[model samples]
Target chain A: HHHMIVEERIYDLRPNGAREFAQHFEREGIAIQRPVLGRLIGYFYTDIGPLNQVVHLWGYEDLEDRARRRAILLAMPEWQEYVRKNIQPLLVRMQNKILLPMSFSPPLPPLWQPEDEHAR
Target chain B: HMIVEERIYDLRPNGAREFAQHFEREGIAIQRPVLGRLIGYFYTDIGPLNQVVHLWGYEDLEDRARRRAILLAMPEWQEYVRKNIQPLLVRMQNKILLPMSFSPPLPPLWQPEDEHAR
Candidate 1:
């Protein structure tokens, strides 16, 4: 069964909150989420299309897997703390999409490497 | 040396399947070789409808510029675009995304220093 789902989470920050949100996530939020979420494909801030949006992609085995992961993350006190401090204050709007990869789609990029350099 | 370019194409009614078929049968052979690393290729399953979304990884802006130029210049690509690609679309959107610290690496399959660089 060649099945997986990619979740695209879009956060539309206050007009000027993009830079600060990004900085805060890098410093604190990521540390709390990465351990639990596991398949962090890519996290990006818009540069050429859709200004002031933070987009992050996550891949899961399926919808069931996605639900379980969400439950685990939400239960963590650290994530809740980070969300309250960083996410709530700067937030404006959010959107989430569930995308299924085409059969011909290439493999998702690796999350960890043996050498361990250039993470961003 | 990290950037991902996302191209979103809104196709005509039921054009998603047809367009994907064409790309799979013929276009991908020519397109993928020239485009380098494909971060992903997907059609919306839950959020948006009738859209084909594809992401390409590049070293930077210059790298995308160079590779894309070569792609555009190819007669094969031009033919594919004119005959198949352009007709299926309703709208096209391009976004340049800068990776955050926890983002995974997308090592370029074809480097700027390669002989193919022109």
Candidate 2:
């Protein structure tokens, strides 16, 4: 199966609310799988660019795996509850795209590559 | 520092493909010094837009001006701009960004960590 990269744009929300959403994702075990460079590697935004515009990238083993993960996340009680309490209102529009890794590279250095003893 | 994320959309009838090729052949030389090896380029099928998006890193406004001035002044660039880029530009959207440093890891992913992480 081909690897998948998904990019999503999160629209404007209260600062506290956005942080809560990030924290919520971390509470989920899905946080461990976040791109290795940092806890927030796959997600970012330009606060000054276009207000409320945030972008992030997530990788999946394959299309089927992505579908399965979505199913699991949606069914999780905590996830469902969080969505109801925190996300539904602030969300403006979400755009998701499934991308193919074409000539791509991994996250940088000590964070992503523990195997590289030579890296400083 | 400012972060610029520009999204270019190709017009129908193979506009996107042609624009990408134009970048590979012409755009690279124009912007080479400021560009590291390209990170990656994607073809998107958004509901109303079929586009190409790229991320560029700049130190500041002056740096952007210097590089962009050089690119715009090139005779070849002007020629290519007239022939290949002008027609489809109406479909493009440009967004200039002033990045925020709220998180500890402010400048994200400056270099590839390993073979698999980027």
Candidate 2 Cα errors over 4 Å, as ranges? A1-6, A14-42, A47-49, A59-62, A68-86, A98-120, B35-39, B97-118
Find the candidate with the highest DockQ and give its number.
1
Kindly list the per-residue Cα lDDT of model 2 for residues A1-120, writing each as its tens digit. Answer: 145444444456655455555555545433323323122223555444455555664555556755665676666676566677756766766766644333333332123334332231
Q: Give lDDT for model 1.
A: 0.81
What shift in Å separates residue A110 of candidate 2 from its native position after superposition? 12
Whose lDDT is greatest here?
A: 1
Docking class of 1: medium
Task: Evaluate every candidate with DockQ and list the scores.
Answer: 0.66, 0.27
lDDT by residue (tens digit), candidate 1, B1-118: 6899988888887788888888877887777778888888888888878888888999889988998999999999999989998998899999999898667778457444542432
Instruction: Give the winner by TM-score.
Output: 1
Per-prediction backbone clash count: 2, 9
- lDDT for B31 in candidate 2 is 50
> What digit string (tens of lDDT, one per residue) describes model 2 on residues B26-99?
66445544333233355554334545555455556676677677777878778877887777664665555433
